[PDB]
Amino acid sequence: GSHMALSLTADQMVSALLDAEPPILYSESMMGLLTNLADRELVHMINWAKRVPGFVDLTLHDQVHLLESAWLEILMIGLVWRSMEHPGKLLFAPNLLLDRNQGKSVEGMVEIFDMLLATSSRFRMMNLQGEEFVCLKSIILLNSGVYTSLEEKDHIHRVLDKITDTLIHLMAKAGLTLQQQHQRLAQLLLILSHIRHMSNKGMEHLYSMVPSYDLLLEMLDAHRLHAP
Amino acid sequence: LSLTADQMVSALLDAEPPILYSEPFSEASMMGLLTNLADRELVHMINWAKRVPGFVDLTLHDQVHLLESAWLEILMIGLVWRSMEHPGKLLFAPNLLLDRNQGKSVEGMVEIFDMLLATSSRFRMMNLQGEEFVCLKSIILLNSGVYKDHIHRVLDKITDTLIHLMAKAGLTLQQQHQRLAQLLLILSHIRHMSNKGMEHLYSMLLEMLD
Ligand SMILES: Cc1cc(F)ccc1-c1c(Cc2ccc(/C=C/C(=O)O)cc2)c2ccc(O)cc2oc1=O
Numbered sequence: 561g562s563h564m565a566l567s568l569t570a571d572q573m574v575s576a577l578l579d580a581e582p583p584i585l586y587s588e589s590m591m592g593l594l595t596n597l598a599d600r601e602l603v604h605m606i607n608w609a610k611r612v613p614g615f616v617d618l619t620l621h622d623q624v625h626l627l628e629s630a631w632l633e634i635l636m637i638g639l640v641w642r643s644m645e646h647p648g649k650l651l652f653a654p655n656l657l658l659d660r661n662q663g664k665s666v667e668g669m670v671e672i673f674d675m676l677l678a679t680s681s682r683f684r685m686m687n688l689q690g691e692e693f694v695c696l697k698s699i700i701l702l703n704s705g706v707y708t709s710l711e712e713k714d715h716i717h718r719v720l721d722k723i724t725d726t727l728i729h730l731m732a733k734a735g736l737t738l739q740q741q742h743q744r745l746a747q748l749l750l751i752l753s754h755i756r757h758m759s760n761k762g763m764e765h766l767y768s769m770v771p772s773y774d775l776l777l778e779m780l781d782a783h784r785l786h787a788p
Numbered sequence: 789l790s791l792t793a794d795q796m797v798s799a800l801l802d803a804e805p806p807i808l809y810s811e812p813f814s815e816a817s818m819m820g821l822l823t824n825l826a827d828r829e830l831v832h833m834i835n836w837a838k839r840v841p842g843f844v845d846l847t848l849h850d851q852v853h854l855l856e857s858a859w860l861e862i863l864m865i866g867l868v869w870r871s872m873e874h875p876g877k878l879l880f881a882p883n884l885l886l887d888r889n890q891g892k893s894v895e896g897m898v899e900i901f902d903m904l905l906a907t908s909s910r911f912r913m914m915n916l917q918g919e920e921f922v923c924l925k926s927i928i929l930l931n932s933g934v935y936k937d938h939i940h941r942v943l944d945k946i947t948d949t950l951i952h953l954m955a956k957a958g959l960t961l962q963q964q965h966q967r968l969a970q971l972l973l974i975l976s977h978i979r980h981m982s983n984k985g986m987e988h989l990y991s992m993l994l995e996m997l998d
């Protein structure tokens with residue numbers, strides 16, 4: 561059978577997102593290594609993205625739009641998640657744990673590094689859970705590009721409300737008061753604005769030294785050819 | 789800090805800057821007109837910043853950084869608010885209502901226009917209220933240069949304040965959290981616009997604060 565996204569309970573949404581997680585990939589000149597990693601991560605992101613409840617309900621063209629706006633933020637949230645148990649360090653991959661100082665070997669890279677580090681330490685001191693993380697990553701995929709067919713927008717927003725509900729359930733089951741539930745949610749959603757900022761600074765940097773709409777369309781298209 | 793939700797709102801409503809006026813247009817004239825308008829609003833913005841509860845308690849360094857980081861986001865949300873009832877147009881001032889065609893007269897400008905219009909169309913579709921608006925505007929000032937325990941206390945207070953307005957208007961407990969989220973996710977898109985806007989402006993405080 562098939563569960564429509566707007567029918568999911570909070571626990572079924574959490575279970576769907578946890579089950580969709582991509583694996584942690586390994587690293588194979590700093591930049592060449594990072595690009596290869598991202599490239600490989602990308603193929604997996606696509607598989608993940610189609611398992612986000614509500615995503616395949618959209619037109620294909622709308623799917624690519626959302627993925628074109630969100631892809632670098634998604635890479636980044638994952639990076640900051642992996643880096644959480646390693647203060648001062650970015651875990652690009654387990655064989656590629658880089659610190660602030662190595663970052664200074666690439667011009668302008670330290671600033672983004674420091675932004676990424678600060679986001680990671682904020683997640684750490686907030687004690688972000690795995691179950692919250694997956695909610696935030698999905699929110700990113702659905703939200704980044706939604707402000708740039710009226711039924712598609714409404715549907716995307718209704719799925720966003722569902723993940724929000726799911727985040728509130730997690731916080732209520734963790735014992736937070738209503739005030740605390742609202743404040744932590746707000747705090748998590750503001751971190752998302754900073755992740756957007758990081759992404760834009762990241763993109764500026766990449767264009768100055770990248771998946772287009774057309775490649776992501778092709779990669780989305782290619783997914784349908786995968787052997788199950 | 790000590791204030792109630794009512795007092796916070798009241799304070800925010802009282803601190804609101806005025807709507808300024810602009811002083812047929814060419815490209816260079818339209819941009820001079822927008823520049824001079826924004827220059828004039830920045831003065832009032834600094835003044836409004838100082839009346840935001842919690843802001844002057846920060847160090848002057850933190851006050852300058854937040855404002856330097858957030859000024860365009862603030863200009864932009866004020867614009868999107870003003871333009872809300874004007875489908876397909878940006879109300880930069882009552883005497884400077886500009887349509888999508890008018891923005892095509894400067895290289896790169898129209899892309900930002902569309903993004904501003906979408907934001908504005910989104911606040912209309914949501915029925916953004918004045919009191920919610922002022923809360924969001926203050927969240928932007930406190931959030932945009934944030935990444936310190938004190939900033940986050942004020943933020944939590946504004947969150948609480950937004951929720952109380954929502955409660956006051958009869959929204960269920962689920963509707964409240966849903967709406968709060970929908971609004972703070974708009975803040976992501978406003979940050980993005982600011983970034984795009986800054987990029988374009990490179991393709992060309994200490995006093996009022998101290
Ligand atoms: C650290 C950094 C600085 C930038 F300034 C731009 C991007 C990054 C960055 C990369 C590096 C990166 C390098 C190249 C590309 C290019 C992709 C492509 O060409 O398809 C993408 C990311 C990254 C790679 C893998 C990953 O899991 C997370 C990451 O998070 C980041 O913030």
Ligand SMILES: Cc1cc(F)ccc1-c1c(Cc2ccc(/C=C/C(=O)O)cc2)c2ccc(O)cc2oc1=O
Nearest residue numbers: 822823825826829863864867880900985986988989
């Ligand atoms: C529409 C736009 C496109 C850009 F690409 C950059 C900024 C804007 C923009 C401006 C125009 C603007 C033009 C010049 C300057 C400053 C120039 C300078 O200091 O030299 C600032 C704003 C603006 C002006 C007043 C206002 O209330 C809101 C506004 O919102 C915007 O998004």
